[PDB]
Design a protein around this nucleic acid. Structure first.
Ligand code: ZN
Ligand code: ZN
Ligand code: ZN
Ligand code: ZN
Lengths: 504, 466
DNA sequence: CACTTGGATTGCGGGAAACGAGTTAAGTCGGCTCG
DNA sequence: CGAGCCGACTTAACTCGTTTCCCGCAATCCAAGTG
């Protein structure tokens, strides 16, 4: 349904590609920054504006008009109208707002929202933009220069400038809690880029590698990086991720598959503490590689302040930590045969608590279901990024002013706001008839108002012949005259026609 | 070596005039179904008339008549075309997510009063509830016999369980590790392997060969081939099933412990092949439908060779076992869904979807045209909502489009009354926000808001606050 | 023994849609006038 | 030498009371995701 011009969008891709004890750390520093914001919010609209706003729209509008012109030759297929260069920021808000709004009423195709079919009608869309205008903008929705990069068949730089817009805001609006975590999220949308072979764990993901750093209690996104490289940059996994957060003693909980003991020193150099799983083909002392435990038994070894522990489950469970002592404690778990509960290393219990109630932004991706089937690669990625920005706006809103809402309502209200244009810009002849004024076709409801006619004779409730009716040689009287220009007019259509039409 | 060919018949067993949607559906669902639902719904409500605390301003109860029940289902089915997340938000008056059609079909409270009464059994009259399913029993009874006598399946059949998801109080909470639903009602059913047509049913209910033989019962004495998964067959079952003239193929003599990769050995006894192949695990194959052979086939998956050599039995097994999912996978997520507390409603809804599915399969058998199930369902809802003096809604919030200054769109039209008189006035929206009752018969044609001439109309479009 | 959330499920009530009784505001048309 | 103002007559917008339901919130109790 769409065409590509640069041989990168939707190219070079295919289908179907889917020392025998352990002290706790005592040198636990809390010398960090406040868990707060750098901005003023009174309501939902103010919160949204910190991440998404008019400058976002200017960017989208400028690029959209440029793209269409460059490729205008295959629009020969035609359109009802061609003001395609005339997209302005106010139209683009409507374009985006309608897409977000669609998640509240979910239909199967984009083309079924703009319908006239009375059975499943949703009239608001029809009253906001026309069907063809939306499609024309859709084809023209584009995110980049399209003529600056000629040196390589990159297929990344195409969405790069969108990400560049949002990243500094995730960093400068809000700062996170002592505990952070890493993951790899993303939408199940049939994208076209496959690097599955380099994963270090996963959430169903499309297109490119995506790295998230999130606050452990709230789900706020602290950083994001995409397509870090094809496995070449996934080791030293967090070095490009937590860079702006160094020296803050954040504790990082992770489950990446490429951690190591050696890696832990790097984290200490940058003042981070970690907890996560460890692979066996790693710098694990050999004497701990050949062990046997009874179910529920643990073994602990340490070197320096790094604890390597094994708890025995169906699988031995390995955990590496630079935070906890090797102590056992009752967990909340109950065995099917025992109400006495199961005792586990405190580190494991703590680890699991901080890996949940996180990455809430990804949890809501199912909302934008319309973006799955027939979408160009770059549109899907840009939408992920917009959703992330809305999520962060919500989290801040809620954290600054405690109220109960939910992300779902935050989004509905935001869409209504964007879609609303609430910004304002004496003789025998009782009266000599006149010619039609030059202001006749000035379209303004603030000026062409209706008032009753007041006479000069004994009877003030005077009626006069309508000018429009005079044109057709009809005699019909009215009590009303246009106030702007003194022409007697009937109420209803004659007043509308006189001020609206070139003739009458 | 199957030497008896096939003694069945295929396709419609009835005079189904398949030239439209309506005549495909009525075979399974129709007016007598609704007569059943109405009779029980009116008895249920009145028999339990006390303890309702009906409020003062709601509508008074009126008994349910057949059209309302047809509307009732039609609206529920449409909710699958347009999805909203709360049952009562379909009646919202907010202009941006409005779906006005529902509002014009029946009111919110009427829908809630019918919903409550959508009952399936006269438990008040018959109290001999020894049967945990006695409350859905007549629903199950209504639909299954039709599946059997409308259409006959071709030679290859398969057996599996249907799924009705449910985390609340139920007959059982047993989960079979080889099944796809963690919890809910499991249904035992046969279907035709190519179309998914559902042929016969039983409900996992109450608490091997006794049920295998029972479900297949209407299909004995004709040489049907039945394909089975890990938990339905046995060697002994095969022997028994042969006595009723049908053949079995499926999965489930220690020598098989010996190992070989690539081509492997079989044990063959008494015309039953008991071959064991090896993949990640020993692959057991039992068959009374073909001779032993091993040959290549084109895999869907990428493989080391263009084609991979496998026991012929696996080649056929993995082509016929699709019938089970196409038979109802749609029905697990399309409408007639709830998070209700009545298990009876969830189960009854599953049964309704089976009937709609079978209607679709029949339709396609006759016509060469290809359309999905989804369109069959949408059109059905349209038909049921078609008719084989409602009050105007009050305003609740002022539309976001009122400030758009286009004098071609905003115009005064006279109100047209839905009641006895066409002329009827309404409260002026510009005056009632100051609690001044005053009445008018002119309205903005684009916005649907009542206004007075001039002084009110101008303010409503021009002023941010009025 | 859950954690968390929000959709069913339960009602209560501010307000106005509808109909008819009973007084007002704007229209039809004439036959005389000033352009 | 062209088309209207005062007056006497008809319809069409407005109060007011009164019954009857509209959907919008607001309060409890579990069923979905996965310790
Ligand atoms: Zn004017
Ligand atoms: Zn006129
Ligand atoms: Zn209007
Ligand atoms: Zn008014």
């Amino acid at each position: 349904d769409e065409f590509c011009a640069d041989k990168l969008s939707n190219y070079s891709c295919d289908s179907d590609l889917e020392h025998v004890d352990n002290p706790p750390v005592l040198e636990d520093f809390l010398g960090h920054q406040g868990l707060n914001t750098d901005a003023v919010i009174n309501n939902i609209e103010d919160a949204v504006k910190l991440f998404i706003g008019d400058d976002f729209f200017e960017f989208l509008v400028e690029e959209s008009n440029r793209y269409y012109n460059q490729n205008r030759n295959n629009f020969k297929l035609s359109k009802k109208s061609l003001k395609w260069k005339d997209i302005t920021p106010q139209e683009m808000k409507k374009f985006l707002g309608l897409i977000v709004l669609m998640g509240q009423v979910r239909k199967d195709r984009r083309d079924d929202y703009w319908t006239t079919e009375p059975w499943t009608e949703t009239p608001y869309f029809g009253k906001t933009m026309t069907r063809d205008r939306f499609r024309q903008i859709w084809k023209a929705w584009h995110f980049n220069n399209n003529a600056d990069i000629v040196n390589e068949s990159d297929r990344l730089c195409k969405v790069r400038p969108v990400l560049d817009y949002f990243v500094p805001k995730f960093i400068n609006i809000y700062k996170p809690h002592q505990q952070l975590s890493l993951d790899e999220g993303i939408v199940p949308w049939r994208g076209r880029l496959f690097f599955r072979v380099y994963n270090a764990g996963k959430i169903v993901k499309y297109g490119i590698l995506v790295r998230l750093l999130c606050e452990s209690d709230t789900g706020y996104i602290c950083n994001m990086e995409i397509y870090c490289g094809e496995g070449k940059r996934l080791l030293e996994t967090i070095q490009t991720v937590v860079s702006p957060y160094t020296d803050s003693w954040y504790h990082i909980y992770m489950d990446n598959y490429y951690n190591s003991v050696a890696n832990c020193e790097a984290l200490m150099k940058n003042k981070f503490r970690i907890c996560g799983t460890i692979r066996k083909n790693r710098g694990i002392p050999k004497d701990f590689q050949t062990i046997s435990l009874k179910k529920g038994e643990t073994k602990f070894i340490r070197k320096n302040d790094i604890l390597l522990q094994v708890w025995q489950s169906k699988k031995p469970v390995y955990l590496i930590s630079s935070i906890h002592s090797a102590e056992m404690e009752e967990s909340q778990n109950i065995d099917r045969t025992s109400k006495k509960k199961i005792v586990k290393p405190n580190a494991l219990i703590d680890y699991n608590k901080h890996m949940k109630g996180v990455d809430r932004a990804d949890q809501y991706l199912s909302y934008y279901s319309i973006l799955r089937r027939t979408v160009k690669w770059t549109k899907r990625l840009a939408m992920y990024m917009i959703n992330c920005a809305l999520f962060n706006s919500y989290a801040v809103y809620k954290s600054v002013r405690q109220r109960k809402m939910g992300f779902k309502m935050f989004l509905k209200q935001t869409a209504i706001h964007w879609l609303t244009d609430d910004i304002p810009e004496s003789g025998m002849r009782a009266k000599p008839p006149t010619s039609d004024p030059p202001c006749r076709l000035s379209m303004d409801m603030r000026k062409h108002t209706l008032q009753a006619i007041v006479g000069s004779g004994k009877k003030k409730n005077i009626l006069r012949r309508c000018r429009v009716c005079s044109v057709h040689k009809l005699r019909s009287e009215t009590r009303y005259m246009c106030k702007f220009c003194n022409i007697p007019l009937h109420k209803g259509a004659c007043f509308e026609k006189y001020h609206t039409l070139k003739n009458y």
